[PDB]
Amino acid sequence: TKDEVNSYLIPLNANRQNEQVFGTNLFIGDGVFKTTLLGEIVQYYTHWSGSLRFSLMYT
Amino acid sequence: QTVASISSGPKHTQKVPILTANETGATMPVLPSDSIETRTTYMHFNGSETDVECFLGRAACVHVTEIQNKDATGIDNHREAKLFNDWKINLSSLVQLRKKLELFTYVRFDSEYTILATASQPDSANYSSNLVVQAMYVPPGAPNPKEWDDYTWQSASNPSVFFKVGDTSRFSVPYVGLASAYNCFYDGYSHDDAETQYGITVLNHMGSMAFRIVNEHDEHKTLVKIRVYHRAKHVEAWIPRAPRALPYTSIGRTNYPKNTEPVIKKRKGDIKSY
Amino acid sequence: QTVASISSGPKHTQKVPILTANETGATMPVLPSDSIETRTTYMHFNGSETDVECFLGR
Amino acid sequence: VINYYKDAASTSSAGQSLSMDPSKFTEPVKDLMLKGAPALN
Amino acid sequence: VINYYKDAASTSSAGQSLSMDPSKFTEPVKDLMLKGAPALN
Amino acid sequence: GYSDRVQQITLGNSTITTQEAANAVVCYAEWPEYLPDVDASDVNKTSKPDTSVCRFYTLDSKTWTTGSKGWCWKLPDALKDMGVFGQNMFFHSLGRSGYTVHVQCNATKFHSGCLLVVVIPEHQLASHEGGNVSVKYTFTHPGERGIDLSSANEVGGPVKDVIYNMNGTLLGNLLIFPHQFINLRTNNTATIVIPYINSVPIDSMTRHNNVSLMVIPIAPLTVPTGATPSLPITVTIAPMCTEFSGIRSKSIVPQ
Amino acid sequence: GYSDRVQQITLGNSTITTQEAANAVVCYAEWPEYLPDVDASDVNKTSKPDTSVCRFYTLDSKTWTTGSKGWCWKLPDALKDMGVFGQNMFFHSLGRSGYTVHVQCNATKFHSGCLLVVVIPEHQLASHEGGNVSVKYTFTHPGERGIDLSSANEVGGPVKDVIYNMNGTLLGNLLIFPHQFINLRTNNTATIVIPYINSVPIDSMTRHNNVSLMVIPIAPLTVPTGATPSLPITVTIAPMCTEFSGIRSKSIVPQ
Amino acid sequence: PDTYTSAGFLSCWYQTSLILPPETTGQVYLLSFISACPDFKLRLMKDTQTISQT
Numbered sequence A: 001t002k003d004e005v006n007s008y009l010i011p012l013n014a015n016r017q018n019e020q021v022f023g024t025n026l027f028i029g030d031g032v033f034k035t036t037l038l039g040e041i042v043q044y045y046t047h048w049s050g051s052l053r054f055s056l057m058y059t
Numbered sequence B: 001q002t003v004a005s006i007s008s009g010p011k012h013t014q015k016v017p018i019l020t021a022n023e024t025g026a027t028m029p030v031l032p033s034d035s036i037e038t039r040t041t042y043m044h045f046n047g048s049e050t051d052v053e054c055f056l057g058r059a060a061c062v063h064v065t066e067i068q069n070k071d072a073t074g075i076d077n078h079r080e081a082k083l084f085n086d087w088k089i090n091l092s093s094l095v096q097l098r099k100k101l102e103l104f105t106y107v108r109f110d111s112e113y114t115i116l117a118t119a120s121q122p123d124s125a126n127y128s129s130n131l132v133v134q135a136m137y138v139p140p141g142a143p144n145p146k147e148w149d150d151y152t153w154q155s156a157s158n159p160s161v162f163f164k165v166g167d168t169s170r171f172s173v174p175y176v177g178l179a180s181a182y183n184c185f186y187d188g189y190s191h192d193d194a195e196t197q198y199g200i201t202v203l204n205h206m207g208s209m210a211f212r213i214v215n216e217h218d219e220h221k222t223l224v225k226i227r228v229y230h231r232a233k234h235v236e237a238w239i240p241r242a243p244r245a246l247p248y249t250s251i252g253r254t255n256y257p258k259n260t261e262p263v264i265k266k267r268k269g270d271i272k273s274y
Numbered sequence C: 001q002t003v004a005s006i007s008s009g010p011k012h013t014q015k016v017p018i019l020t021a022n023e024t025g026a027t028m029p030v031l032p033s034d035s036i037e038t039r040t041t042y043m044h045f046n047g048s049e050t051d052v053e054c055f056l057g058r
Numbered sequence D, E: 001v002i003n004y005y006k007d008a009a010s011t012s013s014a015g016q017s018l019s020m021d022p023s024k025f026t027e028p029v030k031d032l033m034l035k036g037a038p039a040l041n
Numbered sequence F, G: 001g002y003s004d005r006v007q008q009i010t011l012g013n014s015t016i017t018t019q020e021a022a023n024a025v026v027c028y029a030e031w032p033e034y035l036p037d038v039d040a041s042d043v044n045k046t047s048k049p050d051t052s053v054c055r056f057y058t059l060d061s062k063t064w065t066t067g068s069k070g071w072c073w074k075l076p077d078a079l080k081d082m083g084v085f086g087q088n089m090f091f092h093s094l095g096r097s098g099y100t101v102h103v104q105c106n107a108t109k110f111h112s113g114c115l116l117v118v119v120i121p122e123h124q125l126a127s128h129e130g131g132n133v134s135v136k137y138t139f140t141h142p143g144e145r146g147i148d149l150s151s152a153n154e155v156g157g158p159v160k161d162v163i164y165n166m167n168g169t170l171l172g173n174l175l176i177f178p179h180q181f182i183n184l185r186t187n188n189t190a191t192i193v194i195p196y197i198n199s200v201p202i203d204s205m206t207r208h209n210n211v212s213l214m215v216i217p218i219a220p221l222t223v224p225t226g227a228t229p230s231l232p233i234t235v236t237i238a239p240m241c242t243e244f245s246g247i248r249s250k251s252i253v254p255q
Numbered sequence H: 001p002d003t004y005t006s007a008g009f010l011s012c013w014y015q016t017s018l019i020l021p022p023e024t025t026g027q028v029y030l031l032s033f034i035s036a037c038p039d040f041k042l043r044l045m046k047d048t049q050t051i052s053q054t
C-alpha cells in the first residue's frame, strides 16, 4: 500500500513445488527497476544497450 | 579527361551488342558506339550534383506549427490554447522532402536543423512585441510540458534553444537511429499482436520538440508561426525503390487515397501520336 | 577496438564465477560469458556522453 | 576547412563520393554477360 | 582550439576523462576476490 | 558446352534443375553470408542448422489464368510452417537468413505470356481504406498461400491494385528491384538469390518480413486455339546462411 | 580453494550450479564426441544445431515419499517434446547424441535417505506377463513423465519390481553401470555425463532408446519429527554433440 | 518503455522446494539486486521523470 522495507523482501514458501516465486518484465526504466540506482541513472538517457547483472541473495 | 564517346566506325560481325535478353534481369551497358558510327567526345562532367550527399544535402521545410503569446489566466489546457505547442518529430509530414528520402529504403545521415519563427498580430496592437522563443527537445521518456510554465522548461538535461522571433535558430544533430540506418519503410510490427500498428510509425518514436514563448503576455495577442527546416549531411543510402506515384494520405504509412486521378498521362491521340 | 563479449563455450568446472556472497559488500564483475555460451562482439562505444564533464556540462 | 566544433555532426557536407559503380544494379547476374556475346547462349 | 581569454575558467569543456575505473566502488574489499573462486573460502 | 539456359542448384538434400533459365540474379551482386563478429551486437552464440533448414521448400502452385492479377509472398513468413526452418523461427527470439528463390512456369512454343518476378526489400503495404488505416498482422502474414492480387479487399487488409504495387508506386518501376522475367517464349524459370538485407545485424523473424516476392503477369497469358486457358506457376524457396539466436519457449502469433 | 562439492555446468544458454555434489561421472571414462568420418556410413551431411538443442531441459519433479519404489526415464524419449531438440528428433530419419544428466534432491541435515542414480545402456524391459509377451511401444516411451515403479502393471506394459530392475537382474548389481548416489547426508545432486553408446554410428531416435535413467530409493526417506513426509526429486538433462541426419517430413508415432 | 525495443521477461521458480529444519517456522526471504555489466552503454542525455516541482 505504501513504500516500505518489505517492498525489497521476496517471500519464499516452504514445501511448494515447481511454483513461481516472482516475475517482471525488463523495462529497466520503469516498474520495479524505476527507483533503483540503475533505473534512476538509466532514465537520464534515452537509449541503452548491454547486459544486465541480476542477483539473488538467500537469507 | 573522361571520354563520353569513343570513335567507332562501320560494323559487320557476329558480335551483336544490341541483341540482349531483358528477362535475365540485367540492363546491358549498350552505348551509341554500339549501333551507330561515332566520333570522339569528352565528358567534361563528374556528376557531382547528383551525388546522394548533394541530393539530400539541402534544407527543406519539414514542419510548420503555431504558438501564441496571450494572457494565460483561466486557460485550463495550455497545450490546446497554444500557449505552447508540440511537434512529434518526423520527416514524412510534408511531401517534398519525403518523396526524395523514399527514393531509398535505408538512409543514414546527420541532420542540420534551421528553425524560423515569424510573428503576426491579426487584431489591434500598438506595437510588435520582441518575443523570445524556446524550442526544447523532449526525448521519449522525458516529462512533457503541461503548462507553458512547467518546471520542465528548466531543461536541465534536455537540449533546448532560445532565439528571437523573426530570427532563425540553427544547430545540427548526429545520426540518432537505434539501428545502423533509418528505415524509410518497414514491413513489420512492434510485436506479434493481432491489432497493433503496421509500418514505420512503429519505428519512428523520436520524441517531441516543445515550443513556447518565454515572455509574459502583452495587452494584445501575438501569433507566432514556427517553421522547421531539415538538411542532411554525411549521407548514405541503400536499396533504391520505385518513386512515389500516388499522393500521400498519412504520416509514415504508404496508404493512398481512394478514387485518385490516373497518374500516367493519357494520349491526346493514338499510340502512334507524336 | 574494445571487445564487448569474448567467445566462450561449454563449461564444466569447479570454478563457479556466478556464485558469490553479496554480504561482502562487493559487486563481482560477472559477465554473460560466465553463464552462457557467447560469440565475439565489440563495443564500438567509449561512453563519452556519460562522463561527469558531459553530465553536468550543459 | 578548420573545424570550429568538437563533434563530427557539426562539420559541413562530405563532398563527392567518387565511387559511381552502377553494375550492382544494372548487372546483378550470377554468370557474367559480355556485351556482344549471346545473352542466352 | 585557440584560447581567446586569459583565465582558465574561460576555456570550454574538458573532454572525456578516459579513466573509467569502477572497482573502487564495485570491489572495495580488503582481501582480493577472484572471479570463480569461493567468495567465502 | 555450357549455357545460362541449363542450371542445377543443390542445397541440403534438395536439387532443382532447369533447361530453360535466363541466367540468375544475385540481389545487388551480393551472395548471402553469415553474420561477422564486427557487425554483431547480440552476445548469444548463434545456431546454424545448416542442411536441415537450408534446403528447397515448394509452395502450393498458383493457377495463371487469362485474368490473373498476380501474387505476393513474404519472407520469412512464406516458410513459417516449413519443416525445421519454421520451427526455429518460432523457438528463437532472433534470426537472419538469405534465400534462393526459384519460380517455375512452362508452356509450349505456341503459348505466350510474360511474368515479372521481383524481390522487394521492406515491402510496406498500404491499406485500401486510405487515410491512416493500418494493415492488421494477419493480412501481411498469409503464409505459403501468399496474397492473391485479384482477390477482393477485406477489412484490415492491404490494397491489391497490381498497378500501384500495393504501396502507391507504379508497376513499371518495380524493375529497380532485383528481378527477372519469365517470358514463355524464352523462359521456363526465374531464379533470384537474396542476401540478408536489413538495417540491423539480426531481427525477429515473426514480427518483420524482410522482403516480399511478387510474381506479376505483365503480358497476359494466351494459349493456342482450344487449349486449357491456364498454366500452373510454382514457387520453390530455399533459405541459406541461416542463423538463429536467443532460443526460448515457442512463440505464439496472432491467429 | 576448489572442491568436488561445488560445480557449474554451462551448455547453451543454460547453467546449473550445485554446492553439494559428489564429483561427477563420465560413463566409461569417455566424453561425448561427434561422429568421425572413419566410423560413418550414412553419406548424408549431418546437421549440428549446437546451442539450440545442447542445453538443459528440466522434467516435472517427482515426489519422494516414504513408500516410493523409484522412477525410470528413457533417452532420447524423455526429451521428445523438448524445444528444438524434440522437433529435430521427428523430422530426421537418423540422429545421435550424448547427455549430461543432473538429478537434484535437497533436504536438511536432519533428514536421511539414499537414492541410486544410474544410466543403463540398452535397458530392454521385461513383460510382467512372463512367457513371451512383448512390451507395447507406448509403454517404453513414457515421455518426460517417465515410468513410476510403484504404479500398477497394465496390459502391454513392463514389469515394475524395483528389485529385479524391470529385466530379471538384481538391483544390487546395478552398480556395474555408470552410477552415482544421492545420499542426503552427503549429496544434494548427482551428475552423469553420457557419451553415445551404440553398435551403429547413428540410429533412429524414435524407435530405439539408447539408455534409460533410473532414480531408485535404496535407503528409504525419513524426515525429522513432524515434518512433511516427502521431498521433491528433479531431473535436468542436456543433450551434447547432437547430430541429426536424413531430414524429411515429420514422423508420426504410436499415439 | 517501448514495445519494439522490449527486453523480455525475468522469472524465478522452485527447482526442488524450500526445506526448513526442525523448530523453524519463520518466513524466508530473498534479496534481489540489479547492476550493469561493463557491456553497458547509454546515449542521448535527457531529463528524468523522477523529479519535479510546482
Ligand SMILES: COc1cc(CC(=O)c2ccc(C#N)cc2)c([N+](=O)[O-])cc1OC
Binding pocket: B089, B091, B111, B113, B137, B159, B173, B176, B182, B183, B206, B209
Ligand atoms: C532539431 O530538432 C531535433 C530533431 C531530432 C530528430 C532527428 O534528428 C531525426 C532526423 C531524421 C530521422 C529519420 N529518419 C529521425 C530523427 C532530434 N533527435 O532525434 O534527437 C533532436 C532535435 O533537437 C535536439
